[PDB]
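Our collaborator T.R. sent over the components below with a one-line note: 'Predict the complex.' Nothing else. No constraints on interfaces, no templates requested, no preferences about which chain binds where. So this is a plain run: every listed entity goes in together, and whatever single assembly comes back becomes the starting point for the next discussion.
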Amino acid sequence: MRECISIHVGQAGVQIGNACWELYCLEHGIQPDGQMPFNTFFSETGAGKHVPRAVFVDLEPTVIDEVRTGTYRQLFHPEQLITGKEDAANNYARGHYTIGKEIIDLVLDRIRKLADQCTGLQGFLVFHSFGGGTGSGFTSLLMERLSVDYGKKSKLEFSIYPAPQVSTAVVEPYNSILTTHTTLEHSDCAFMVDNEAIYDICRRNLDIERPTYTNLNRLIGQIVSSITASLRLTEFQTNLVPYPRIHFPLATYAPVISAEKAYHEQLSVAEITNACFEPANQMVKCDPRHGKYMACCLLYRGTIQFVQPPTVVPGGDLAKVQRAVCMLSNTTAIAEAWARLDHKFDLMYAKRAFVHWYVGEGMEEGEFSEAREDMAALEKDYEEVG
Amino acid sequence: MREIVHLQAGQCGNQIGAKFWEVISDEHGIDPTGTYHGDSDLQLERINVYYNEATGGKYVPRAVLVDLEPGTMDSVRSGPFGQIFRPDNFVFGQSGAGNNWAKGHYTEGAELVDSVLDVVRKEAESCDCLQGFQLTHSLGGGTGSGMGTLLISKIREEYPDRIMNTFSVVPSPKVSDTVVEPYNATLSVHQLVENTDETYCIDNEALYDICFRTLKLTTPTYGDLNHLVSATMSGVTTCLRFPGQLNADLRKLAVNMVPFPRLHFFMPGFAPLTSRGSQQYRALTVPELTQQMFDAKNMMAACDPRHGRYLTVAAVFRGRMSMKEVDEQMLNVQNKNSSYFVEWIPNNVKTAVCDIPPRGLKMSATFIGNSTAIQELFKRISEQFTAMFRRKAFLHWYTGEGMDEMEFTEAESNMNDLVSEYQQYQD
Amino acid sequence: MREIVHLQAGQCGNQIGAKFWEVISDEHGIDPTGTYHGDSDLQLERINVYYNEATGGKYVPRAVLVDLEPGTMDSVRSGPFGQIFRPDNFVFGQSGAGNNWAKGHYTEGAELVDSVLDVVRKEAESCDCLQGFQLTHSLGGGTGSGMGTLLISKIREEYPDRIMNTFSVVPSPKVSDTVVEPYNATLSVHQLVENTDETYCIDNEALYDICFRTLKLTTPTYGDLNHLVSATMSGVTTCLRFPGQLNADLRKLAVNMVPFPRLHFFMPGFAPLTSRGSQQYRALTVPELTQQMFDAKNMMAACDPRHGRYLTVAAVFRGRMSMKEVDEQMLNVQNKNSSYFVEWIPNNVKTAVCDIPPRGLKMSATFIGNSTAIQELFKRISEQFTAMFRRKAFLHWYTGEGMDEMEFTEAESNMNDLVSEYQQYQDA
Amino acid sequence: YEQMKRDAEIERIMMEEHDRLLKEESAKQERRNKERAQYYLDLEKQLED
Amino acid sequence: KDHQRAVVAAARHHLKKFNHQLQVAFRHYDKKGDGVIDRAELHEACVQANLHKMLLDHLFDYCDVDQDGLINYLEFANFLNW
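Returned assembly:
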C-alpha cells in the first residue's frame, strides 16, 4: 500500500523508462504480457493481468509508437501513452507556452485516475532531461500543476544533467537555466546524472568500448530500482536537503564491474564503501575534492571532508554481485558545474544568439534575465552555506 | 502527425524532385504502382508525414509539380516513378516565362498563381496539424526562381507560424550557363531572406569537385548530381519519420542553428562517399567518417570553411552505432581545432542518431555546416553585378514589363547588407 | 404512396425531362417494356411515387407530354417514353410555335392545353394523397415559357396546396444559341415568382466548366450534358422511394430549406464528380466528400459566392455512413469558413441522410443549396432588356397579340421588385 | 557469435552488389564499341557514294 | 446501341402480342425446329410473325441464355413473351 506513480516525459524519459519497466517486470515474476505464469507499482485486475502505474508522454509519435508496437504492448492500458502531433522543436517556448496545452489536460486526467485507484500515496517519479524543449517546458508545466494540485506528497525527478564539455544541442544552456528557474520550488527532490561521466565510467570500470544508450539506461534503471528497493521515500526528503533550494543529490553505484574481473575480485563492504567515494567512480563529472560533502545516504542492497540482492538483466553487462551499495550523496562540488553552465549561457546571451524564436513564441527579453539572476542566487547560496 | 507538403519549381527542381520521390519511395518499400511490398512494420507507421492514402490501399505523394513549359511535366510523368502522383495536381502554364523575372514574378506567373495555391490548399488541408512545406529550385533561371520566390512569399502570408523549408541550387560563376544570372540571383535573395525559415545553398561547381576527386567518376550526367541532393534531404528529416536513440525534429534543428535571424543559409554534405574501385578497403566506423564530413572537398557549396570561422554544426547520423563515439569524437574535432570555431559559442556542435540506415549501407551520416565565409559566395555575385548594371547591359528586357532602375538597387543592398552582417560576427 | 404530378415543356426541358426517366428506371428495374428487374425489394416498396401500374407485369409512368411542334415528342419517342407510357397523352400538333412567348401562350398554347389538363386533372383525381406538381421547362425560349407559365398559372387557382417542382435553365451571360432569350425571362417573372415551390435554376455555361476543369472531358454535347442536371434531381426524392437513417420529405424539404415566402430558387450538385485519372489519386470518403461539394467548382451558376452569403443550405445524402462523421464534419465546415453563412439561423445549414446510394458507387451525396449569390444574375436580364427596349428591337410578334410599351415596363419594374423586396432584407 | 554471423552475411551481400556494378560497366563498354563500329560502317558507305 | 436495344424490345413486345393472338404449340414448334434461341430459328420466327438479318441474329444472341444459347428454354418461351 506504499505506492508510487511514474511519469516519463521526453525522449530521454521514455528510453530510461523502457529499461526501467524491463527491470521491474524482470524483478518480479511478471512476464511482459502482464500475467504471472508486487503491487507497490502495479495494479492487479481480476482476470490476472498486471498493469503498471505509468504514463508516457512525448510530442513525436515515433518514440511512443516503438513502445506501442514492440514487445511490451500487452503490458499497458493503451491510453496511458500520451502522443502529440508536432514536437516542441527544442523550445521551452513550445513545450511550455504553445504546444503543451493540447495534451496537459489528458496528462492530468490520467494522473487523476491512476491516483484515485490507489490506497496510500507516497510520491511520483518523473523521468526527464535538461536539454530539450519538452524535457524542460512541459516538465515545468506538469511540475507547477502537480505541486499546486496534490500538495505535499513527494515528487522525485531524475535528470540527465547537461555535461561539462560535450552536448548535442547548441541551445542547451538556455533550456537548462530556464527549466531550473521554475522547477526549483515545485519539485521535492531531483537527482543528477551526466552522460560524459557515465561514458568514462563505462570505458574504464566495465571494460567496454563504444557504449550507447541502452548500455546507459540499464545502469540508470539499476540505480532507480536500488533507490526504491526498500518497498518490496519521505525519509530522503527530510534527510538530504538543508534548505529548500539545495535538492540536487548526486548518485553512484559501487560494484559496476564485468564478469571477467568480478570472478577474481571479491566485493567487501569496505571495498564498495570506498569505491563510492573514489572520484573516478562518481557518475557526475564534477571535482569532489574541491567540494565538501554535506550529506550521504548509503543503500546496501543484498581529506574526505564532511562539512534482496541486485537482479540480472538479460542481454546485460553488469555482473551478478551479491551485495551492492547505491550512494545518494550531497556535495559542495556542483558550484563549478553551475558556474560553467551559466557562463555558457552568458556567452550566447551577450549578443542575443537564438533568442528570437522564443521571443516570438511567448516570452520577453527579461524573462531570461529572471532565470539568470535566480541562478546567480543559487550559487551565492552554495557560497553562503560554504 | 507532424507532416509536410512537397512542392516543385521549374526544370531544375523537377529533375531533383522526381529523383527525390524515387529515393523516399523505395526507402519506404513502395512500388510505382503504389502497392506496399516491405519487410518491416515500421514503414507503414509514418507514411502520413509525406504521403496520403487512396482507395484500395494505395499511397499518393503529397506534392505539386509546377513549371511554365509543358515539356518538363511530360518528361516527369513518362519516367519510371512519375505515375504515382495526382493527375489533377499537375499544374502548368502555356506561355513560357523564358528567364524573365518580370514574367515569373509580375505578369506571367499571375495567371497561374490562382491555380497553384488551391492545389496547395486542398492538399495541405487534409493534414491534421501542419509542420511546414518544401520548395526545390535554383536561383539562376526565371520561373524556377521568380515564381519560386512568389510561391514562398505568398504562402508566408497565410501559414506564418510553420517551418517552410526550401532548397536552392545556387548560380556558380565559374560553372555558368546563363549570361544574365546575376540579374536573377540578386533579385531572388531579396524575397527569400525574409520568407523561409531555412534554406540550403548547394551549387553545381562544388557538385563537380565532389564528383571528380572523392567519387572519381568518369562521366557524370545530371542523374548522379541530383542523386547527391535527394539523399541529403532524406537525412535531415529521418527523425521526422523514424525513431532513434536520440532524435532531433525539423523545428528543433531550426532553433539551435541560426544565431540571429538573417543567417539561415546552410552548407549540406553527405558523409560516406567512396569510389566504386576503393570501397572494400575502407573501414566503416565513426572516427573514419568524421574525417570525410569535415573535408573541404566533401562540401556541396563552393565556399571554404578555412577562409572563415564556424558558427554552428549539425550532424544527423544513421545506423546501429554507439553514442560515446559520437559524443567525444565531435568534442575532439571541436577541441583540437580551435581557430575555426567561434568563442562566444562554448559548444558548437549538435547531434542526432536514428536507428534505420539508408538502404544498402551499414552506416551513414549527414553534415550541416553553417560557416561564416559564405559571404565569399555573395561577394562573387555582387562584383558580377557592379559591372553589368553600371553600363546597364541587359536591363531593358526585364524593365520593359514592370520594374525600374530603383527596384534592383533597392534589392541589391538588401543582399549586400548580409555580407556585412557576416562580417561583424566574423571576428 | 405519395405523389407529384408531372408535365413536360419546351424544347429544353423536354429532353432533360426525357432524361428524367432513365435514371429512375435503373434504381428500381423497370425495363422499358415494363418488366421489373431488381433483386432489392426496397425498390418494389414505393413504385407508386412517379408511376402507374399496368396489368400483365408491365409498369407505366406519370407525365404528359406537350410541345407545340411534332418532332420533339417524335424525338422523345425515339427515346424510351413511347415504349413505356400510354400513347394517348402525347399531345402534339404540326402547327408553328414560332419561338414567340405570345405564340406559346395564346395560339397553340390556348388550343392544345385542354387536351392535356383533362389528363393532368385525371391522374390527380384517380388517387387520393396527391401533393405536388412537376413541370420541366426553361427560362430561355418564348415557346418554352409561354406554355410553361400557362401550365402553372391557372392551376394553383384550383390546386392551391401543392409541391410545385419546376425546372428552369436560365439565360446565360455568354452562351446564347437564340436571339430572343433576353425577352422570355421578364414575361416568366410576372407569374412564376408567386406560383412556384421549388425551382432547379441551371444555366448552360456552368455545365461546361465542371466538364472542362473537374471532369477533364473535351466535348460537352447536349447528350451527356444532362447527367449534371438529371442525376441530381433524383437525389431529392430518395427519401420517398427508399428508406434511411433519417427522412426528409419534399414537404419537409419545403419546410426546412425554403425560409421565406418567395426565396425558393435552387442550385444542385453531385458529389463523386471527377476525371478518369484523379479518382484513384483522390480519396472521397465523407472527410473528403464535403470538401468537394462546397467548392466554387460544382455550381450550376457563374455568379460569385464571395460576393454574397449563404442563406439556407441543405444537402441530401445517399449511403451507409456514420452519423457521427457527418455531424462532426458539417460542424467543421460550418465553423472554419463560418463567414460564408448568414447571421439569421444559428445553425445555418441542414442535413438529411438515407441508406440507398446510386449504382456502381460505394457512397455519394446530392448537394442542393439556396444561396444568395444568384442576386447579380438579375441585373443582367435588366440590362439585356434595357438594350432591347429603347429600340423595341423584336416587338412585331408580341405586338401582334399585343403587349404595349407600358405592359413590358410594368413587369420590368416587377423584375426590380424581385430585387427590391430582396434588397430590403439584403442589408439590415 | 550471432553478431559475427550477421557481419559475415552483410559483407557477402555488399560484395554481390559490387559484382553487379562490374558486369554493368563491362556491358556499357561493349555498347560504346558497337557505336564506334556503326560510325565506321556508314562513313565507308558515304565514301562509296 | 440504346436505339437498337429499344428496337429489339419492341420486337419482343410484338412477339408477345402475336403469342396472345397456341403458346404451348409455338414453344413446341420452336423446340423441334433449330434451337430454343437459335438465331436461324429466330429469323424463321421473324419471317413468320412478319418482323423483316444481322440485327435479327444480334437480338437472338441477346435473348439466347449466356453460354446456353437456348434462352433457358422455359425462359426462352418467357422472352418470346416479354
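Summary for T.R.: The interface with chain B takes residues 10, 14-15, 17-18, 21 of chain D (CB under 8 Å).
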